[PDB]
Symmetry: C3
C-alpha cells in the first residue's frame, strides 16, 4: 500500500543512506551533507533492511534485500557492492 | 496484517524512540529511562523508517514516513519536527 | 509478498543480528565474525524492528515484534531474552 524504506547514518556531517523498495526494486538515495543523490545500490526486492558501522573513517554497509523467494545480503566496504555470506538457514 | 514499526536509540541510559505506522498514521513512543511516553511526532503514513546520530550530547533524528503517494523526511534537531530536504528522485 | 527483516550491528568485528518475520514467526540469524548461525530469539510476529547499544563491551538489544494484535518489546541484556516494559499506548 506504499513504498517500504530503510535508513542508516554515520559520522557527524552526517552521511545518510535511505533504501526504498518500490515496484520490484530497491534503490538508494544518499546524503553526504551537500544534497541528495542517487546511489549505486540497485537490486531486486520487496523488503529492505540495513545496518552499518565505521572502522575508523571507513564505512561498512550491509543491506538485506528480500525478493519473494530469497533474502540476499549486499556489502559495501569501500569498493563496490558485493554479495555477502548471509543465509537465512544453514 | 499488523502494525509496522521502526526503532532508534542513543546514549547509555539509553534513549529509545519507537515509531509505529497503524491505521493511516505514524506515532511515536519514547523511553528516556523513566517510563514510556507518547512523543510529539505524528504524521500520516503506512511505512516508517528512522535513523539518528549524536553531535556531542544533542540528538538528531530523521524519520522517513511513506504514505501511499510520497516519502517525506521529518527532522528532529532539538527544536521541533521540521520537513527535510529528502526526495526520492531528482 | 516477501519476508520482512530488521538488522543491527555493533563493535568493529562487527557483530550483526538479522531478524526475519516469515510464516507467523520472527527468527534471528547471527554473525560474530565466524560464520552465520541461528540465534536464540524466536517469537510470534509479522513485523519486526530492532535497535541496540553498547555499555562498554556489553550489548543491549531491543526487538519490537508485532503480531496482528500486539507489539511486544523483547530485551537482550546478556542473560536471555526478557519481556520489556514497552506499550503502544498508556
Amino acid at each position: 500500500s506504499s513504498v517500504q524504506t530503510a535508513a542508516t547514518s554515520w559520522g557527524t556531517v552526517p552521511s545518510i543512506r535511505v533504501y526504498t523498495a518500490n515496484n520490484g526494486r530497491i534503490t538508494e538515495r544518499c546524503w553526504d551533507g551537500r544534497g541528495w543523490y542517487t546511489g549505486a545500490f540497485n537490486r531486486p526486492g520487496r523488503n529492505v533492511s540495513v545496518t552499518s558501522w565505521l572502522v575508523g573513517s571507513a564505512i561498512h554497509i550491509r543491506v538485506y534485500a528480500s525478493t519473494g523467494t530469497t533474502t540476499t545480503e549486499w556489502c559495501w566496504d569501500g569498493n563496490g557492492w558485493t554479495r555477502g555470506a548471509y543465509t537465512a538457514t544453514n
